Design an enzyme around this catalytic site. Structure first.
Site, PDB file in Angstrom:
ATOM      1  N   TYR B 137       0.812  -1.208   0.000  1.00  0.00           N
ATOM      2  CA  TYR B 137       0.000   0.000   0.000  1.00  0.00           C
ATOM      3  C   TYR B 137       0.853   1.269   0.000  1.00  0.00           C
ATOM      4  O   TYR B 137       0.419   2.310  -0.486  1.00  0.00           O
ATOM      5  CB  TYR B 137      -0.930   0.022   1.214  1.00  0.00           C
ATOM      6  CG  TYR B 137      -2.094  -0.936   1.138  1.00  0.00           C
ATOM      7  CD1 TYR B 137      -2.316  -1.704  -0.004  1.00  0.00           C
ATOM      8  CD2 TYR B 137      -2.964  -1.085   2.213  1.00  0.00           C
ATOM      9  CE1 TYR B 137      -3.374  -2.595  -0.070  1.00  0.00           C
ATOM     10  CE2 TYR B 137      -4.027  -1.975   2.160  1.00  0.00           C
ATOM     11  CZ  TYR B 137      -4.224  -2.727   1.015  1.00  0.00           C
ATOM     12  OH  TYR B 137      -5.263  -3.624   0.949  1.00  0.00           O
ATOM     13  N   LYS B 183       3.423 -15.637   2.938  1.00  0.00           N
ATOM     14  CA  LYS B 183       3.435 -16.327   1.652  1.00  0.00           C
ATOM     15  C   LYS B 183       4.887 -16.793   1.474  1.00  0.00           C
ATOM     16  O   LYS B 183       5.469 -16.686   0.397  1.00  0.00           O
ATOM     17  CB  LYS B 183       3.046 -15.364   0.528  1.00  0.00           C
ATOM     18  CG  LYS B 183       1.904 -15.862  -0.315  1.00  0.00           C
ATOM     19  CD  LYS B 183       2.147 -17.289  -0.766  1.00  0.00           C
ATOM     20  CE  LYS B 183       0.932 -17.845  -1.476  1.00  0.00           C
ATOM     21  NZ  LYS B 183       1.066 -19.302  -1.712  1.00  0.00           N
ATOM     22  N   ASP B 215      -3.157 -18.203   1.605  1.00  0.00           N
ATOM     23  CA  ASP B 215      -4.125 -18.982   0.837  1.00  0.00           C
ATOM     24  C   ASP B 215      -4.760 -20.096   1.679  1.00  0.00           C
ATOM     25  O   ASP B 215      -5.959 -20.337   1.597  1.00  0.00           O
ATOM     26  CB  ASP B 215      -3.511 -19.533  -0.465  1.00  0.00           C
ATOM     27  CG  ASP B 215      -2.139 -20.178  -0.265  1.00  0.00           C
ATOM     28  OD1 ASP B 215      -1.191 -19.479   0.136  1.00  0.00           O
ATOM     29  OD2 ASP B 215      -1.988 -21.382  -0.549  1.00  0.00           O
ATOM     30  N   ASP B 239      -5.800  -6.875   5.602  1.00  0.00           N
ATOM     31  CA  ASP B 239      -6.982  -6.204   5.089  1.00  0.00           C
ATOM     32  C   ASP B 239      -7.984  -7.259   4.615  1.00  0.00           C
ATOM     33  O   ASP B 239      -9.135  -7.273   5.024  1.00  0.00           O
ATOM     34  CB  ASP B 239      -6.572  -5.320   3.913  1.00  0.00           C
ATOM     35  CG  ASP B 239      -7.469  -4.120   3.739  1.00  0.00           C
ATOM     36  OD1 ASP B 239      -8.483  -4.008   4.451  1.00  0.00           O
ATOM     37  OD2 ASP B 239      -7.145  -3.275   2.890  1.00  0.00           O
ATOM     38  N   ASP B 243     -11.538  -8.528   6.694  1.00  0.00           N
ATOM     39  CA  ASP B 243     -12.869  -8.466   6.114  1.00  0.00           C
ATOM     40  C   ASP B 243     -13.529  -9.838   6.078  1.00  0.00           C
ATOM     41  O   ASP B 243     -14.697  -9.972   6.423  1.00  0.00           O
ATOM     42  CB  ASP B 243     -12.830  -7.817   4.724  1.00  0.00           C
ATOM     43  CG  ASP B 243     -12.632  -6.307   4.793  1.00  0.00           C
ATOM     44  OD1 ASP B 243     -12.707  -5.732   5.900  1.00  0.00           O
ATOM     45  OD2 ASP B 243     -12.398  -5.687   3.737  1.00  0.00           O
TER      46      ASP B 243
END
Lengths: 343, 343
Positions: B137, B183, B215, B239, B243
């Site tokens: 970001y 990851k 994942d 993020d 959610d």
């Protein structure tokens, strides 16, 4: 209909043959002009030739119109340089397969297996199309030091264009709705992805296009997954969203997948080789039969027949559920009823 | 217990006061030495001072030990340079808040609101800790052209170290289990993140540490979310995972959140300002009361009392459910029963 069959290891030969029994039945009934040849692949190939993707097989997949893949892998080859899995990598690279299609469908009557309440699991039939060759997984520059590490999420127009086109074409054969997923509100790459897909979409007036942020999409797939058809996104987002969607049906063994691109397309069940179950019968052939349906649909455009096979296994699942679904139907038993509903 | 209260717009003043009624009740009962002052923030501040985070408020939050935030925003300020939301940004930056805590809990008896089958929704009580200042970001280099676009996922050791420490400290007050999500199997940044958290963990022998790929984590949160306690990960992963987890309880209005860092911590309900409901009563104060509990726990280490408040609202939710939960309890009504179970 020139099909290259690569049964693979473990339960591969058994489940693959079950798919072939369905394909041969359709061939008799519709005269598809099926012509298939089986080639050595995976661990079997290593043991017989020294490599997972031998010359005769490479030539065979190149001469074919489609590939039906069984399963690869096993503890016998968890050591050594030559691993059964590099065979998948080589296959994919040799044909320049750039898009991965992973369906998640909750067959009617099987809502009970979903982690979601039956009201919301009902009707789920989504197809995730994931860009396979670009993105952060392969982006430059990349590195690591004592103080920091970096990786680059990079995408060029052509990469976005091609994966987007398979999504639209895939959509035309379904419910004609595509949702492109990005992170446009914060990232340049997201904005680039969005504007590129919006442009490509202009050439597909018959398909509806919508855009969604990956964070919102994660929520949507859990709150209301039934409202989607085709979903297209980048490499990493597609990886995460594919796995999330894969748990929706509540049984990984029922999932097929396909890789499309410039060369011969590949169709294969998602499950592993399950070597301790090999030769006993019992293996669930659903995923392999559904891969054959994916072949009919994506490689040959025979959407109607693919749907015919799909309804057949749907009924078969309720009628004579395989052991992995609390039933006792063996491989041949399950296939028999699929065939009966195909008549 | 010096608390800076920033009620905000819409339903903010109402829900914030409800939290204060709970805090004042505890103060009488335990002598916490509560001392709070309310300051103008958000749209109200723009209308009264011209800016969302006026001087008196900035000084006020700086002098306090914690901030209780109401809600900000409204159609009245959807135009102009000065937006109520920049106030959040300025607040966060002024205090160098680098970690975002977002709990997802399925209160017993309320499993019916979850998108998940009751068997799996039962017992969910997970806390996502998201790195807020770094990652893709804000990473460099970044850009876009006619042919391509790029963004960089970059992380330095210090950034990973600090967010990791809040996760461990947060865990000590809970079930002492932390799962760091990365990851690592494909990305350098992932491997860097993993090895850094493994190192930081050495100083917290009393807390268990596990690692998971983003994942796989997406699947776990849907298949078996009840098995987790504290989850820590990077900006973008946090993020998405925040959610995803937020939909688990089945009602966004019940969610509180906190931002921790070097300066004064901020506690606030996740929901919006709901201006069309302002002044009618009816607003659900659950999220604001739960933010007050988060304050007691994270800003003051009063874990026992926070749990006391939590059980109180849990009971209140079953006893006199708010309108948004199919009940008819108004703001004061709901708060009254919370207070009754706090005695």
């Amino acid at each position: 209909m020139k099909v290259a069959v690569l049964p693979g290891d473990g339960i591969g030969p058994e489940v693959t043959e079950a798919a072939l029994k369905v394909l041969r039945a359709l061939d008799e009934a519709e005269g598809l002009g099926l012509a298939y040849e089986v080639f050595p692949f995976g661990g079997a190939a290593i043991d017989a030739f020294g490599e997972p993707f031998p010359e005769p097989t490479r030539k065979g997949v190149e001469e074919a119109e489609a590939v039906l893949l069984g399963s690869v892998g096993g503890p016998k080859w968890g050591t050594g340089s030559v691993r059964p899995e590099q065979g998948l990598l080589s296959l994919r690279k040799s044909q320049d397969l750039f898009a991965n299609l992973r369906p998640a469908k909750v067959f009617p009557g099987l809502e009970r297996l979903s982690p979601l309440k039956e009201e919301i699991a009902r009707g789920v039939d989504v197809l995730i199309v994931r860009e396979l060759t670009g993105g952060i997984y392969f982006g430059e520059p990349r590195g690591m030091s004592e103080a920091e590490a970096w990786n680059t999420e990079r995408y060029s127009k052509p990469e976005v264009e091609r994966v987007a086109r398979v999504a639209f074409e895939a959509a035309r054969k379904r419910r004609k709705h595509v949702v492109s997923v990005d992170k446009a509100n914060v990232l340049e790459v997201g904005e680039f992805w969005r504007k590129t897909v919006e442009e490509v979409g202009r050439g597909y007036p018959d398909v509806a296009l919508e855009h969604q942020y990956v964070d919102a999409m994660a929520m949507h797939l859990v709150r209301s997954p039934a409202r989607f058809d085709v979903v297209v996104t980048g490499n990493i987002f597609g990886d995460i969203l594919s796995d999330l969607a894969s748990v929706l049906p509540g049984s990984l063994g029922l999932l097929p997948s396909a890789s499309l691109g410039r060369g011969t397309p590949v169709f294969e069940p998602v499950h592993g080789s399950a070597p301790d179950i090999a030769g006993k019968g019992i293996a669930n052939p659903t995923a392999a039969i559904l891969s054959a349906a994916m072949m009919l649909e994506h490689a040959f455009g025979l959407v109607e027949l693919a749907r015919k096979v799909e309804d057949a296994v749907a009924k078969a699942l309720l009628e004579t559920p395989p052991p992995d679904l609390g039933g006792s139907a063996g491989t041949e038993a399950f296939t028999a009823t699929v065939l009966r509903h195909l008549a």
